[PDB]
Scaffold this active site. Sequence first.
Site, mmCIF file in Angstrom:
data_model
loop_
_atom_site.group_PDB
_atom_site.id
_atom_site.type_symbol
_atom_site.label_atom_id
_atom_site.label_comp_id
_atom_site.label_asym_id
_atom_site.label_seq_id
_atom_site.Cartn_x
_atom_site.Cartn_y
_atom_site.Cartn_z
ATOM 1 N N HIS A 190 -25.514 -24.935 34.537
ATOM 2 C CA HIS A 190 -26.212 -26.166 34.869
ATOM 3 C C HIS A 190 -27.717 -25.952 34.856
ATOM 4 C CE1 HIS A 190 -26.141 -24.102 38.752
ATOM 5 N NE2 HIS A 190 -27.162 -24.858 39.109
ATOM 6 N N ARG A 207 -34.630 -20.915 49.087
ATOM 7 C CA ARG A 207 -35.085 -21.515 47.842
ATOM 8 C C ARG A 207 -36.223 -22.492 48.072
ATOM 9 N NH1 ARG A 207 -30.570 -24.108 44.955
ATOM 10 N NH2 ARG A 207 -31.107 -26.024 46.098
#
Lengths: 281, 281, 281, 281
Positions: free
Chosen positions: A97, A268
């Site tokens: 992805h 992240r």
Amino acid sequence: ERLSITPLGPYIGAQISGADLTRPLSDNQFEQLYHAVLRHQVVFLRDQAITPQQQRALAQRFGELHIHPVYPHAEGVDEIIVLDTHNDNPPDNDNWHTDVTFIETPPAGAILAAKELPSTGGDTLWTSGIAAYEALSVPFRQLLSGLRAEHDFRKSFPEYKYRKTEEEHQRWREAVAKNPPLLHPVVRTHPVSGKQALFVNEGFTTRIVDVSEKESEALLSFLFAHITKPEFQVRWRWQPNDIAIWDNRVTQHYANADYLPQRRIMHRATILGDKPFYRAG
Amino acid sequence: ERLSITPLGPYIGAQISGADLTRPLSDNQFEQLYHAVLRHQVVFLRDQAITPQQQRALAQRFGELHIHPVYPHAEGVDEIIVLDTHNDNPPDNDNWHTDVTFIETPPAGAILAAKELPSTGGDTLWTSGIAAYEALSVPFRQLLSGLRAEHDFRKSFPEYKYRKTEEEHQRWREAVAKNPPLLHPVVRTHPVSGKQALFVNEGFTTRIVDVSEKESEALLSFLFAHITKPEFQVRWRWQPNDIAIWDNRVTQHYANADYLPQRRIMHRATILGDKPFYRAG
Amino acid sequence: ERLSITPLGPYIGAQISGADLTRPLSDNQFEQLYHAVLRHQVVFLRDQAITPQQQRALAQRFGELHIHPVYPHAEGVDEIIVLDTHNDNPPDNDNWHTDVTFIETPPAGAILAAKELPSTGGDTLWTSGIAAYEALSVPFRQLLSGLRAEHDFRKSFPEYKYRKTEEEHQRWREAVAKNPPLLHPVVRTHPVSGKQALFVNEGFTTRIVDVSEKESEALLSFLFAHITKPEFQVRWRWQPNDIAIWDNRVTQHYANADYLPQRRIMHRATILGDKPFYRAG
Amino acid sequence: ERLSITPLGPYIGAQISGADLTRPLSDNQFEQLYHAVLRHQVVFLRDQAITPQQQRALAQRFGELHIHPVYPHAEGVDEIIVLDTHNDNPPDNDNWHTDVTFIETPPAGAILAAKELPSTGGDTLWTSGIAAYEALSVPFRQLLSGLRAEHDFRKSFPEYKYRKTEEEHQRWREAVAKNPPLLHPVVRTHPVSGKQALFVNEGFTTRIVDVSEKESEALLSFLFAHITKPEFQVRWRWQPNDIAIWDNRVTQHYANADYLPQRRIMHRATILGDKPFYRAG
């Protein structure tokens, strides 16, 4: 100080040393780091014991950062998402992805820091949309350039996985309503480098709308296999305090789900992006 | 001396140190090395400046070695094949395959030594047929167990690539005549460990003969994709004097062709194998 | 009177004469018609100038009738669907489907009457699930027998086709609420003959739940292609006042969309079946 | 006399009466027949009790005839193939093919006569390459136009089917020597009408040479499925003494294999065409 940059292959990936990511970087250093991400698409730095505050500051030199209400964030730092996977929260990134391509402005990139790791497993792979595009034959490059494809939240989050409870089902319905399918170019022009990259991904791309449904199935089936060619990829085996910085405009990635029941914690920072476009060569 | 063995993932691959491969190994050392290959399917040792004579001796402790008349061999050592690739001899191993499965007794394994390497590129990947089999659903494991498939020299060496000259075409015809297609089990039982492994490969497997032609195309298309799942693999980036030892009974591998016009020289010892069989669980 | 029955192929299809369907049939004629439908799976009777009222009456002799949640019905005859196609209502059945498998008791039979036809085009084809099952290899028969697949109304009635007006979107919403996705066996045992038949169809079958997602895609892609083999089929070229009666338990059909801008009008009656089941054998 | 011509669909197929093909036709009748074949691509004439000698004579009026290298011919009539199938010679044409595209000048037309038929079964289907091309999206039309594909006699006449005796293996060897693989355009321009048509067929087309191997597999898999769409086709149910005449430049056909152990006998005449070409437009 000049950065040490070691390419990990001819098309994608580099390992970098000589930059302390906890403390501020000089402009010369950051120019090197920036251009290395641009050129090598994903870069890795090791032994970087970064705090969420320092990771936010680093990521913010690339661009402004995504803030989520739905995910947990680091203590006192909303821009750093905590990805804490285990039995009660299994990983869902073991599919090829590009991050969040179902919105009009998918992220330009990300900075990922390894905080807690399982004894083994959890490798992450990146594949180059630029290398994959350049490896197509001329008829396929001419075919795919200028076409548009639909990206749909529901391909990676299908309704049948959200039936367990009525509340869960309704939360899915609300997310779908906020995130209808939309179009992006099949071949994306990088807004800085001008390189052409394949910009479909198995995670979210449902249909090439400028060809028939059966033609689309044939092309996407080929392309989803094509990007798995090993020559287009780099594979990273994580150690604690590794940092990965990548360009989400021209890559896909895949996070191995081979470590449960063990625990894995990543931090992240998501760098906001602009609208993908195609500019003919 | 106890060997240091570091797994590179939960299913396949390990890096080993503490064994000098130029000089003879003790029995305890070799028992460790042997069982590590059995368990981890491919193992890597670095900084092993081995001569072809020492590589032959090492490989011969696993089993007897293949001798080819067609390939160049090391000076004074027929059992060590020299794989010297460049513009005039492009690489042909950038496809998922198990070595020489078109013969009745495909090699049991190999020892590969990196002698001269390009500046970057040429990674080699291995995928586990055991992990891939265990990841199939129960209906697919029951389906594929006990079936037989045809392996054919011509799938990797098709006639249309050997038309350039009449002599070249006739040499291909003679190789085909010596190597007719034959059958192997779709699920192979490892003759030492008893583990079940998928034993088809895109390099040589043309047809599952116990189902219809269209059923076979559907199953093999799925399986050739299934083995490319990153969780089933390990990826090695070579340095000079690296050694790779792998079990060819239960793996496939893929050698990146991303370095021409640069030159790459490997030395290989091929360990002879026996007839693949299936023993039901 | 004894019916005249001419088979149109070895596996499926027959043409019948000797029965006036516009007037009451004797119990003896009806038994003959019923058993011809079971034996030949679809039968055709020509020159039958039936009214919707008469068509419903004949269908009632087979069992309880279904009222379609979306399709328009004939004036004063709720059980008769009107398929009235033209530029302002383009054809909707040029896909291989079994009628109304999205309910717990899919129709066992249907009756179709040609009311107004274009000058040419609009053929309808039937394919036999019994022939298709028998053409599977034994390993494939054993694989599919006992598996279950999800059927979803929305696969052939997707929301985006029903957003032109509030009336039709609300009618769609009510249909979805009354017809949630459900499972049916992949191999269905005919409750009268005991024959086994494939019982998936591209119109409504979304996934096989007893295998992985990628395994389901591979199997359904194969099965959706398998049933298009010409030997499994009969193709009917309509004349006005034709009638087709078929066993909807073990067939699929497909209506060509090749006649716009010409208008085409068919009337359908739809007879509820039992719960589909599989009985090993 | 003016011919009576009834179309069987909007794109392909017509039934013709008013011509006795067993006796000489007037130039005027022949012109009508010829233009009906061009306009409708395949035409059918019933109740034509033709001899092989008369069938060859009619075929000669269309052009120079082909003698098949493998199939048996009628006694004393070398140009008439006998397709005489039964348990001892099972049917060989249940695949989508265009006749004899393995030569430089594939037949422009063919004439088939039904001599002996089973009680049921054995239907033959035709599909229109013109309709199939027009159903492609513009990007797919532009992709395929100008590409070339290889046709190989051996794809439908593989060696392993011709090893029962030395006579038939030697006849196969001679056929291969006279009919090496060659290229034809993927999109063919009809030399009379100027219409564009798809010109690959699963019977003989092995690969598209102007794209990669994996790209070729994807495109041919799509195209071999695309031409099976029912709207592109006409299906003929044979009666003894039927005759079919078709434009073999722009169609494929498929003969059902569903009648063994019953015997079936057809006679074919085969008219050479010109070199296939593509003219952009």
